[PDB]
């Protein structure tokens, strides 16, 4: 099932797997937005990606986690062609969750999840912490904003669940739900 706009929570996803999934979607005409890019995970110890980046530091050197992921997708696209540049403009990778996107459903990619792809006990790095060490200086405020949004969203879920309780109780109250329940619904 495909639609025009998807929001992907990047927490617990591997950088390469998620970018490759994202890149294939973009070339298919699907507008993709990736949020919480600083919770992205990378296989290997912290120093390994750290020496990878400082080698890259030794071209514009960008430190933000959202633009770290954007570079990963960019190498997986035909950027030299008008088709690739069109696809890239369809991708909006952001850190944290902007308010326009926190009120919408967020899907996850099972083929890219770290839990389903990394053996337990394997060391893994986080893009947010790696970026914060190479020059990024906004993880304090991003983390603080995350708590406020998480608190507000948690209250919304409680309100949604409380409203759900009434209809859930009224479901079995009506005898129609049990009159012809043989249909499987």
């Amino acid at each position: 099932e495909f639609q025009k706009v998807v929001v992907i929570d990047a927490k617990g996803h591997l950088l390469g797997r998620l970018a490759s999934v994202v890149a294939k979607q973009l070339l298919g005409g699907q507008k993709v937005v990736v949020v919480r890019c600083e919770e992205l995970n990378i296989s290997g110890h912290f120093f390994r990606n750290k020496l990878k980046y400082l080698a890259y530091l030794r071209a514009f050197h960008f430190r933000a986690p959202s633009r770290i992921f954007q570079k990963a997708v960019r190498g997986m696209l035909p950027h030299k062609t008008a088709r690739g540049q069109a696809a890239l403009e369809h991708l909006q990778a952001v850190e944290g969750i902007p308010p326009p996107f926190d009120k919408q459903k967020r899907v996850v990619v099972p083929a890219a999840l770290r839990v389903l792809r990394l053996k337990p006990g394997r060391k893994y790095c986080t893009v947010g912490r790696l970026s914060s060490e190479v020059g990024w200086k906004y993880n304090d405020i991003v983390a603080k904003l995350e708590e406020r949004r998480k608190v507000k969203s948690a209250a919304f879920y409680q309100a949604k669940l409380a409203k759900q309780k009434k209809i859930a109780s009224a479901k079995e109250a009506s005898p129609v739900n049990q009159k012809l329940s043989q249909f499987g619904y």
Binding site: E95, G96, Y138, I141, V142, L145
Partner: protein
Amino acid sequence: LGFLPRKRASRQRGKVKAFPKDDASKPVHLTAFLGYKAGMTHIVRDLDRPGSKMHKREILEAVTVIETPPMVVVGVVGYVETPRGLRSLTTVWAEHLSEEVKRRFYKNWFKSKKKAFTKYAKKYAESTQSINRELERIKKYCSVVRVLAHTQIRKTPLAQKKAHLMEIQVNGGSVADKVEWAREHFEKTVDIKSTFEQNEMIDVIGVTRGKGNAGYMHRTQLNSKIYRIGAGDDAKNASTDFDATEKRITPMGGFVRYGVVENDFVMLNGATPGPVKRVLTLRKSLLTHTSRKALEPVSLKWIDTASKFGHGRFQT
């Protein structure tokens, strides 16, 4: 290098890259002073300090005069902290404005129909609830409050009648305290002498003096020793502990290319980048220095008011 590459500062005001670290525990105040680089004088400062080689030695060094006194403090500007940087949440000044501020907000004030903040002043006065609602939003949303403050270019003696507006953030104080201080200082004239006495090392900044085919580059004089506030309006601008006699900081018969500052100056022992009448950017130190030499104040014994242009020794 650090200062390299050379580039003259286009803005006359010395836009400060950073400001002193605000803390809500400290009282709501400011950390800037709008100087004007009036002139200089050999304010002999008796460095009364045991152990020091120059013990009680009158330091007849250049007290770089920088006209800095009552500057129009219009209002405040909200500043919310965002993941993409610091964003200005709002900008709510006071209802009362000035012709100099209006002249600054435009380029042909006399040619213009003086429409600068025409309905805005009416909205600020009549629709005070909307201003209060925006102020309430600023106090509840903005992380920092940039207290808007113009200058007295038209008020003080100067050809330029465009008030140098400065978004001087409220140094210290809580959100309510900063708003209350801004409300108290609404449509007021922030005095640099009131902000600081300029009797010790300061963090004066600003562009240099334009030499010709260079200069006028934004600089920051770290630990800029300030002798005393050169109150040009008062006859005792250069009057000191030993000099006294209501000495004028300006040279006898007017300072070279600057005359006598109509208001208080920021006369500082040492150098200060900027030519005569060139607006300075004196400010408080971003960091803290508890050095004994900085802590120990050099007693300003005598000063120089000689008609330097001419008889460089005729004090009277």
